[PDB]
């Protein structure tokens with residue numbers, strides 16, 4: 001009679017919270033989805049072993065189209081768990097799932113876990129300074145999306161930082177690297193000439209947040225465009241004007257050029 | 266020879282991640298601070314019992330003024346942990362402590378946990394649509410803070426949601442309620458008269474996120490300003506232009522007036 005939306009956190013099977021794990025262990029059925037994001041530091045087998053329960057994986061279609069036919073029926077007579085990477089309900093379409101639960105007479109509870117939205121605080125950039133967020137999508141066929149470029153422009157114009165999620169093909173298991181994001185942004189700049197993203201733009205790359213050994217790098221595009229940030233997932237941030245404390249952290253922790261202490265503050 | 270910044274999460278001692286718990290268990294020394302936020306669902310005793318170690322609680326002055334004299338010395342020849350409510354680097358000035366750690370020759374690692382910054386997802390408002398965030402500070406003496414008013418204005422103007430952290434005087438055990446935040450805002454509106462926050466403004470209140478039964482309410486100020494949202498901590502949100510599904514969630518889950526379902530554009 002109860003559905004639990006439980007977040008798995010950032011990188012591996014240990015990013016789930018104690019509360020999350022204990023609740024998942026008491027559930028009769030456990031579902032999971034890995035299309036909003038993957039867990040690069042673990043496997044379904046490791047998550048299953050940790051929880052001590054078989055996990056049924058659901059596709060985007062299973063969820064978006066049949067959530068009430070696959071999950072809710074079981075949540076009517078049993079305790080059911082729905083696992084997702086990061087913090088539940090952060091993914092745009094997930095909140096609506098609670099409406100479906102209510103409509104079906106199912107109670108639902110949300111057990112939080114670390115999210116990239118808060119984990120980016122490890123870059124040293126002040127969280128309050130982040131503006132609207134966006135996703136960099138691969139152009140395709142006759143479709144060349146560029147809204148994320150405008151997001152950066154409006155945020156930076158107000159001295160705000162921009163968090164950029166990079167495209168991911170869940171099933172195809174392929175992620176857009178920070179390097180590819182930069183190349184794409186450089187292309188959009190040549191098309192819009194807005195002076196928003198260029199070789200001299202300062203950027204921060206965060207890779208494998210959640211891991212005990214994440215990659216945090218800050219610098220100008222011209223110098224980071226071909227650098228190796230390691231395995232995915234990657235997240236790209238275009239900061240707005242920096243507070244001196246943000247700058248110092250980037251230099252001392254993210255190996256940024258001392259030059260940002262005079263150019264970007 | 267190591268310092269761990271470990272977040273404890275939102276409500277109780279079980280909001281810590283498994284990773285954080287296992288690491289905190291193997292640490293030689295454990296320090297903590299409870300002035301940056303409130304964990305309404307637990308106590309120091311329960312936390313100590315969970316990790317199996319005594320915790321030396323530090324004041325804001327101990328940290329900001331003597332972190333390098335109290336904590337870092339031990340991290341030189343031992344494994345030390347520094348516990349914090351929510352996520353260690355979110356809406357705090359703790360990031361700078363890693364610089365101090367570095368200059369002292371101490372390696373540091375960050376263990377994330379659920380943060381209110383991403384927990385706002387439970388309000389049904391798309392997290393990518395949040396703009397710059399702000400903190401509503403208690404006026405003091407003749408000094409009356411008002412910058413948060415301009416943040417709301419700037420965001421609303423762009424159609425973005427505004428997250429408002431509420432003030433806290435840990436030593437006085439005083440935690441600002443959403444009601445108090447609304448009163449202050451109406452007062453700033455009278456002063457500035459920018460038509461940014463009035464009795465007809467739609468707002469969302471989130472109290473005790475992290476508990477299994479948080480209070481989530483949405484409605485016009487004139488109706489919520491005197492409503493009881495339960496014990497602290499509270500967070501206030503002034504949404505911008507709503508998507509149909511955001512409105513639907515606010516009505517179905519946060520008990521908002523069915524009239525907001527009819528967006529105006």
Ligand SMILES: Nc1ncnc2c1ncn2[C@@H]1O[C@H](CSCC[C@H](N)C(=O)O)[C@@H](O)[C@H]1O
Pocket residue numbers: 118275276301302303350351352353354355356357379380381382429430431432433471472473474475498499500
């Ligand atoms: N569980 C909770 N429910 C509602 N508001 C909360 C909350 N926890 C924190 N807050 C809000 O966040 C403010 C503290 S700012 C520090 C945030 C913390 N580092 C984190 O990552 O969560 C509190 O004053 C309150 O306004």
